[PDB]
Amino acid sequence: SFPLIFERSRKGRRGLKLVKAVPKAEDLIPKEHLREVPPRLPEVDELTLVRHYTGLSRRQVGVDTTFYPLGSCTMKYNPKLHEEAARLFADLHPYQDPRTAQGALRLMWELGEYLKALTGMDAITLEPAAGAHGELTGILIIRAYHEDRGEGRTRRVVLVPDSAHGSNPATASMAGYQVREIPSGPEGEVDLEALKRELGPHVAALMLTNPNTLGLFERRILEISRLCKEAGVQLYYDGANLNAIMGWARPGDMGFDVVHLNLHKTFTVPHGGGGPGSGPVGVKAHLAPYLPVPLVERGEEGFYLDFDRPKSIGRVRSFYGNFLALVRAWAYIRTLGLEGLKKAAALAVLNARYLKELLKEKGYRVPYDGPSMHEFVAQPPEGFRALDLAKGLLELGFHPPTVYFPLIVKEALMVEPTETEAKETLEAFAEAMGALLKKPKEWLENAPYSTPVRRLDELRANKHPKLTYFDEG
């Protein structure tokens, strides 16, 4: 059991006291503008605050405490070094004179250069706040491109594979595009025939991850690029799976026109329980003019924010991007270097293939198992549902991988161990996976048991939702 911060409150109790002499409200603000009924915020002392949040953290797990083999999430170690790096730039105002923020602007420029070098892009924006935001940015960029070509009314469809992340099609709608889903081949890769059947002057772009969500590299990516090019279709790169090929291959060299990256995935920016993140967007020269403003450019006087771009799609969020996250990513790249990143990608892939071998040995199945990259998708043997096994792992002290995604594999177990996890950890995980298969159905269907809370009434939460402590409305 654990109390809510609101239950810990006590009428009139004070916490932080940041003001010595409090002014009278009516001497500063006209009455009709003053709040009459105070907001019902907690009223607790600092000790209570500390115990509350420290207590909550103890009812929580993270990479720092547990192996998180979440496919499509790259739950790699988040170096403490980076938190120290970030605090070094905490006191900077986005509107302060740029001549006094050259250190910050330089870091942004350099990061942009490193990311372009790793993706093979010609220009880049570090502004988008997350991968999905990068998606919207790139799709709007592609849209501005077509409209600038007089094909604005004909290019109305966006193609995405059946194994795409939900954000892809959701983005098309946000961009005002219609979306068509192309089926994957028998090997889990793009079905060229189905693709050539969908390609036409009505297609604005094709969104792909490479490796794809099955952890497989699209071996015919160059052909796919060729087909898209002749049809005038822009090839969008969902860079969520970049961890698998960092330093070994670049999307730009594959023919991709626009790409987005997830610093909070591939580049160690902490997941923070959902966010925040950073979704830089790189593009080939022909799409550069449509990039959102501002861009960080290097001039002879120094670094500066460039707003002079007539064909820009405009702004996608305030200021210039999640700078502190950018600091983290810069530190990561400057620590590892090219050789460090390559070794990271190789070991991320090695851990994935190794763990795949261990699970198949335990009885797990892999419907699409060509050479696995940074991740793979397994299925439990017939009779077991991913859901229950996930709950069983929770009971055993492990965290389950991603489940029920991609959508093209029933009882999908999307496993991504990343490169920072050790061999013995992969083996311990595989052992737990194997042991759960020897557990009676009922034990599995009622797990977890020892966790701070057991399975929750999801029906109630959806039928009679209580969204706040005061549940108003």
């Binding site: 009924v37 907001p39 953290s57 929580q60 969020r317 700078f323 939460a461």
Partner: protein
């Protein structure tokens, strides 16, 4: 240097087990033409060296602590107790809470955040967070348009220009139409709302720091069947009548003012509060209270049909990763200060801003612009170009004079003050400004 644990013997065994001849062999199935890319990156550096380089970059900047710059971000006190708690490894490194049984820490914290935001806005519900204030506004308006089924939008020019720019991008993408209502005397006049308008947007305090009477705007909107979206700084809600009390349907804003480090613009978080009756159109994650099999209180993500995993193309938004950690920092700030603590901080920044305005009125050639009453920010007409003034101020070691775009008027500059400013700081800034002018 690197973070991989693998020893050479472990690598040999693993390669052998997966049938690979070497690490490079793991990539042998990729098209030969894309292999061995010419990537140029600086040579790896040990952690102490990486830190040295960071400090060198930091040494190049002039810290903005106690800066008088405004425009949506201000130098407020960042409480160490809040940063200490948010630095706990469990909060910092957890992923989105999809396995509730082991994520009650984050789940409950998010539920508490939702409650505080709702209360602050005087509204009923709020999502788990948006990227920032600007995107929150865009999502809030799109929500209003889906709810009313209309495509027209009226937005006060008093809304931060960057917010309006982001709003336009999201709007035109979906084919909606936006009309801007120019400010008059620093405030926005009551517009006539047509039945084609689905949302009316106004910010309070507005971009120039002026307090706006939201009441009539909400009525005007409702009179036409449109929803009223209010953009409001969260800290100000500690003392100003919240949009919810004015009849607002949706409230959005950026959380930087809730003790968050400025971080040269990011990351921070955005909030979106509304009526429970509009929950169906609400984008982003939402936490609900529930119970486990044994009857224990629990929290879990709910109504996920509004999101991308389940709804994909028809999801209310494509938002996946949000701004959870920073949203939690905001919640911790609100909890640490409480209702009276927040009110004091807000009042103090207003007091100092007003004292600064009074002092600045004595500077030769300087004229007031933002009309009274204003909050903790205000704009002045300067006798020299604002960008030129900010630069000269910086040369003297002061951060002030946030240039206001000409659409609002000529030679305008914003000035702000917070609870960490004292009389002596205001005087020092004024002398610096007199020297510059």
């Amino acid at each position: 240097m690197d973070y991989t644990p693998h020893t050479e013997e472990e690598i040999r065994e693993m390669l052998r087990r997966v049938g690979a001849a070497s690490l490079e062999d793991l990539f042998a199935h990729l098209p030969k033409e894309i292999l061995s890319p010419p990537i140029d990156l600086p040579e790896p550096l040990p952690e102490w060296k990486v830190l040295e380089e960071l400090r060198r970059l930091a040494a190049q900047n002039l810290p903005a602590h106690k800066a008088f710059l405004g425009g949506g971000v201000r130098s407020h006190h960042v409480p160490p107790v809040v940063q200490a708690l948010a630095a706990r490894g469990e909060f910092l490194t957890a992923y989105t809470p999809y396995q509730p049984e082991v994520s009650q820490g984050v789940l409950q914290a998010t539920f508490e955040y939702q409650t505080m935001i709702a209360e602050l806005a005087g509204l009923e519900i709020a999502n788990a967070s948006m990227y920032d204030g600007a995107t929150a506004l865009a999502e809030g308006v799109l929500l209003a348009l889906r709810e009313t089924g209309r495509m027209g939008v009226l937005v006060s020019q008093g809304v931060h220009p960057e917010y309006r720019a982001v709003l336009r991008a999201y709007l035109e993408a979906v084919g909606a139409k936006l009309l801007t209502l120019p400010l008059e005397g620093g405030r926005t006049p009551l517009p006539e709302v047509g039945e084609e308008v689905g949302a009316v947007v106004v910010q309070n305090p507005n971009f120039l720091g002026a307090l706006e009477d939201l009441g009539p705007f909400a009525e005007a909107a409702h009179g036409a069947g449109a929803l009223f979206v209010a953009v409001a700084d969260p800290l100000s809600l500690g003392v100003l009548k919240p949009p919810g009390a004015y009849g607002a349907d949706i409230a959005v804003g950026d959380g930087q003012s809730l003790g968050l480090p400025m971080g040269f613009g990011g990351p921070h978080f955005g909030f979106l509060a509304t009526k429970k009756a509009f929950v169906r159109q609400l984008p982003g994650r939402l936490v609900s209270e529930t119970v486990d099999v044994e009857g224990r209180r629990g929290f879990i993500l709910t109504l996920q049909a509004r999101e991308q995993y389940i709804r994909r193309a028809k999801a209310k938004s494509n938002i996946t990763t949000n701004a959870q950690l920073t949203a939690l920092m905001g919640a911790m700030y609100l909890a640490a200060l409480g209702p009276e603590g927040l009110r004091e901080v807000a009042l103090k920044s207003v007091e100092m801003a007003h004292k600064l305005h009074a002092l600045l009125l004595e500077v030769p050639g300087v004229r007031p612009f933002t009309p009274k009453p204003f909050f903790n920010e205000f704009a002045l007409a300067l006798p020299k170009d604002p960008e030129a003034v900010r630069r000269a101020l910086a040369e003297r070691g002061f951060h002030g004079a946030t240039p206001v775009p000409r659409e609002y008027g000529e030679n305008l500059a914003l000035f702000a003050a917070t609870e960490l400013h004292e009389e002596e700081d205001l005087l020092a800034l004024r002398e610096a400004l007199k020297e510059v002018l």
